Structures are given as C-alpha cells and as structure tokens.
Symmetry: C2
Subunit: 370 residues, 2 copies
C-alpha cells in the first residue's frame, strides 16, 4: 500500500476561509448558519453553483496527471438530502466516483460533519458546539448514513474505503485549544454542556461503525479510523481479528506545529523536525497498523524573504514530508484546491500554499509524485 | 513578444455549451434571456458565484506555469454595470489585471458582445438578432465603452491590447453559415431587419474605435482588429502610416472548418490542410501586418478509436497548428477552461479537447 492522495476540501463541506464568495452578504462563520442568513433560493443558487464548479471531471484528470492515485472526499451528514435546510449532494458523490473510475483513482469517503458536531471546530460546520456524541438520536442517524453509503459504494472499483468520522475531539485537544473561544458559538445555550469524546466512547462508536460498514463493502475495501488526536492509543483496538487486513489509521500532521514547539526557522531545522517528530514517531504506529497522514500541508511561518527563496523552502519542505510519508502507508494533502486571493487580500499572503495544485504551478511542490 | 495565449471564454461572457449549472431551470439559450428566466435574486446569485469560481488567481498561476504569456478575455458590453438587467464585472477585470501583472502575463481585452449583436451567434449573447451596426446610439455606446476601457487600462503593465469588437459577421458568413436557423431568434420582431456587417462600414467603425483607443494606450500596446471573417481584405487599411507598429489583425482558424469544406477525416489530411490553408495563406498576411490567430483548437471529428490513438492524433494536431502559428505573431487557444462531463453526459465525448488545461493533463497538448 502506497496511497498518494489529495483532499477535496471545501467542495461538499464548506470551510469559510477557503472561498469568500458563497459567504458574502451574511454574518455566518460556518455551514450551519449560512442558510440562516439567506433567502432559501439564494442559498440553493449559491450552493448548486459552488458544487457544480468547485470540483468537476477536469480536476480528476489533473489529480491523475500529477501522479496521485487516491482522493479523500469530506462529505456532510446531510448528504442524502433529508436534513433541512441543507441541500443533499448524493449526485455529486456519484459523479465523483464515475470520474475517479475513469482516471483509475480511488476515493476515501470521509464523513466530515455530524449533527451538533464532534469537535466544535468551524471545520465541523457548527462553531463552538460539540454535542453529537451526547445525542443518541444523532449518533444512530450517522450510523444509518454510513450503512447507506457502504451499501451504495461498497463494490465500486473506485472505492478505497470509508472513514466513519473526522476529527472527534479528545479531552486534551478540547481543553488545550480552548475551542469555544477560537470558534465562538452563536447560540450560547445551544453550546452549553458540550463535552469532548472519550477514547472508550469512540471505540464503541467504531465498533458500531464497523458493524454497518464492513458487512457492506467488498473484502478488499478498507475502513479508515481517525486517531481522535491520540496517535499512539490504537494498537490493542486495531489489531483485533476482525480488523486484520481491513483497517487504516488516519493521523493529521501539520508542519506548523514545529515553530510553536520552537523549531529554528531554517530548512535543516525543519527537516530534522520532520524526521524526528513526524517520521520517527509515526512509523512506531505503522509497525502494527497501516497509517495514512490524511491531512498535512507545507504551510510555515518562514515563508510568510524573497519569492525565489520561499519557492526553495516550500519545495524542500514538500520533498521532506513526502520522504517521511514513504515509510508509512500513504498520505492525503490538505488540500487540492482553494479560491484564495493573496494578491488582493494581503493578509492571506503565505496561505495559498494550502492549495496543492497552486503549489505545483508555483514550484512549491513536485509536479509528479509517481 | 510572440503571443502565446489562451482565451478566458465563458467567464464574463457566457456561452451555454461550456457550463451547465448556471442554466438549470431555464430554457434560455444565451446571455440575453438568462436573466429573464430566473428571479432577480437567483440570477445575481448564480452570476457572482460563477464569476467567483470560474477564474481566479490560481488560474493565472496555472496559465503561466503551462508556458503561456498572454490571455485574451472576452468582456460583455454591460461590463460597467450600466445595462440592466445585466450585472457589471469591472471588479473581475481589475482582479484579472492584478493577477496578470503578478505572474507576468499580458491581457488582451476583447469586446465580445454588443447591444443587439454584431453576428447573431449564441456566443454574441443574443441568438438570431444582428442589428447593432444599424443602431447609431448603441454604436456610440460601444465607442464610449472602448474609450473608458482604454483610459482605465492603457498604461498598465498587464495590458497587451484592446479588441474593439469580436466577430462582426460578413455577408459570406451570414449567408454561408445560415446564422438565424443555426441560432434561431426568440423574438422574431426583434430580429426583423438583421443584416451582416459590410467591410466598408466596419472600417469606418475601426476608424472610430482607433480614435478612442489609440490616444489613451501606451506605445507598446496595440489595437487588435478582428478580420471580419475577411482574412485577406486588410492590406491597404492596416498599412496606413498611423497604424505602423500599433496594430494586430486577429483571425479565427478552426480545424473543423476543414470537414465542412470536404476535408478527409484523417490525420494526414488534417495536417496538409493545416499547412496549406492555415500556415501558407496566413503567413502572406503576416508579411504586411502582425497577425494573431485569436481563436483555434484541436477539435476534429476523427477523434469524436483507441484512447492511445486519440491522444497521438490530438497531440499531433496541437504540434502541427503550433508549428503553423510560429511564423505568425501569436495565438490564443479557445478556450482555457470548460465544465463538461463527458463521463456521464456522453454527448460531449470528443468535445473536452476544447478545454486547454484538460488537454495538457490528457497529453493532448504539449506540457
């Protein structure tokens, strides 16, 4: 297994900072309140134009042409069209499969947002609220959703696997990042009583999730489990007999961590950090379970310095993490595509390196990975 | 600078066949009738989403990275926002210029549409009507718009030139193509009296356009004249002393033309047509005036056959036409990007080669 992939972020699951247009004329900071700021047929007009244009068949041609073999698609919990006022998108996921299959790529369905949130991040669609795991109606809703998805796509040539939930927040991650001030909740009584997800609760959910997914995918498809911000906690759970051959662990590893643990801002300092804290640490896990780094990027504060030297540094950092990732089972860049305007929004300069495809064109990332 | 360019078709000037989503729920065929089939707030919502997503900074980066140095940008006559119900896009063109200047690209502003239309084509925005040249005040509205546009951009580093009008239809083309059944008019009263644009009238209009453009743009910029589908008619007009060094002639040369004229549909028949009718005749115009082939592509019915053959045929047709344009002053592929789904809408199989970025990723056009 050498999974080489990109994420299709901001496509079916919005993240505000990556495109401004759909948000204009509203005060909404996340997916949940966007329809609450717009006439319903304005909201449907923007949503349908966005999904139509942001990802289309030409982008799967590009991804294959750059050397990747997989894509990871964050999808929302409302994807079947059954949770108003949000708009379903099963058709977009159907066609993405048809495009993956044409270009001999495979798709990891990543269930990225759940009713009432599993992290409280704006990424999760509802800022400052984190109550999905406390509501057994919505946990069961998600379990039915993964079952319908497994039965829909489980035999498709283009299915790599299914990730039952992205980034379920842990007790340490919840208190350390002060989630509910970073992402302020708009409805303060909706927010109160949010709680993080304990490891033992997550393991039970994964049990139930495997009950719905594994019976319904074919024997060569995978279930992909996020590490719940507990990279090293999964050896006992993932080496059970029912999982042998059938599971990948997903860990999200962001280079920007290095400067907040005080890496000197040199190339060689950064690549010692990549070798020692990324490669040397994550391969311990790969000893007993396949690990894909399903979110990483090349963002870094040194590059935020001439244009040429920032090109040199990005390229080295890209190549440095790609060599780290070759001793694992694979990676998915975050992300394929953004609609950032660093030319005219000066504060976003240094942030367009989250757009994988633009990196390739700027000479920040190798043109081919295979 | 030898012009190596792509068009930004379907961005500010819509062309139905290139993008599906903005037309959903309507039977409109062109830019004019789109706002009449939607509710006001839905129309604005779709146009601004389309304009925000279809072209952005990342596209200019990719265009530079593929080796091009210029873009041709079709703009609508309503760009300044003064023509209800249409919505202005001076902001977008402004951002196009900040992006062109960042990535060292030049912009040719190409005025693609005019009030009541200069061809009656669907790409002109009003299907089957062609009366612009017959309405003096809309001829003056286009002149005033070209004057404004040359003052706003004439000294910018990113400006290549300004094209006063795209494709004013000839008598030959108006007859030969059968324009008003190809693009039948919706309002036959509106269409009554449509007529093509004669060569004499077009040269008077060019005189007027050149007087609003040439005094407001720097000496390293150009006014770019579409040939009115008359490649060989321009020697006397364009070799006047006032135009020496300030003019490009734009000719549009499509390979599918060859089939209509009775070309065999083989690679070596395509290649000889390219040598004889493109390279050999256009270079005679290059001898007395700078020429750009402002629109061309590799579409052909042969490819419409193995995947490996099709790739070799396309790539050969890219290289054969590129080689033709090398003895010219440059070209602009039509077009840079489309949103076709040939996988599921099989009517478009053989038609995604109009997407230039997509050709490159399929190995249909050199990296």
């Amino acid at each position: 297994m050498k999974i080489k992939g990109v994420n299709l972020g901001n496509w079916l699951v919005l993240e505000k900072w990556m495109s401004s247009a759909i948000w204009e004329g509203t005060d909404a900071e996340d997916e949940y309140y966007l329809p609450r700021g717009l006439d319903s047929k304005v909201y449907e007009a923007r949503i349908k134009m966005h999904r139509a244009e942001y990802i289309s068949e030409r982008d799967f041609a590009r991804i294959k042409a750059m050397g990747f073999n997989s894509v990871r698609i964050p999808i929302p919990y409302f994807i079947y069209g059954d949770r108003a006022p949000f708009i379903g998108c099963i058709d977009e996921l159907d066609r993405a499969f048809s495009w993956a299959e044409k270009y001999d790529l495979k798709i990891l369905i990543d269930l990225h947002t759940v009713p009432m949130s599993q992290n409280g991040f704006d990424n999760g669609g509802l800022s400052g609220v984190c109550k999905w795991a406390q509501i057994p109606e919505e946990v069961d809703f998600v379990l039915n959703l993964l079952e319908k998805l497994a039965k829909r796509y489980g035999k498709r040539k283009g299915l790599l696997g299914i990730e039952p939930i992205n980034e379920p927040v842990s007790e340490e991650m919840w208190n350390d990042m002060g989630v509910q001030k970073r992402y302020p909740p708009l409805d303060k009584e909706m927010a109160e009583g949010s709680a993080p997800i304990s490891f033992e609760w997550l393991k039970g959910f994964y049990d139930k999730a495997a009950d719905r997914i594994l019976p319904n995918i074919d024997d060569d498809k995978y279930i992909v489990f996020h590490d719940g911000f507990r990279l090293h906690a999964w050896e006992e759970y993932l080496t059970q007999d029912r999982y042998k051959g059938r599971v990948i662990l997903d860990t999200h590893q962001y280079l920007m961590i290095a400067e907040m643990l005080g890496c000197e801002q040199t190339l060689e300092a950064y690549k010692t950090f990549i070798k020692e804290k990324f490669e040397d640490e994550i391969t311990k896990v790969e000893k007993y379970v396949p690990v894909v780094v399903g979110e990483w990027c090349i963002f870094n504060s040194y590059c935020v310095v001439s244009d040429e030297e920032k090109r040199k540094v990005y390229m080295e950092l890209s190549k440095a993490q790609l060599k780290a990732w070759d001793s694992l089972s694979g990676y998915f860049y975050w992300t394929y595509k953004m609609l950032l305007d660093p030319t005219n929004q000066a504060t976003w300069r240094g942030w367009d390196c989250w757009d994988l495809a633009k990196c390739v064109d700027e000479g920040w990332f190798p043109g081919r990975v295979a």
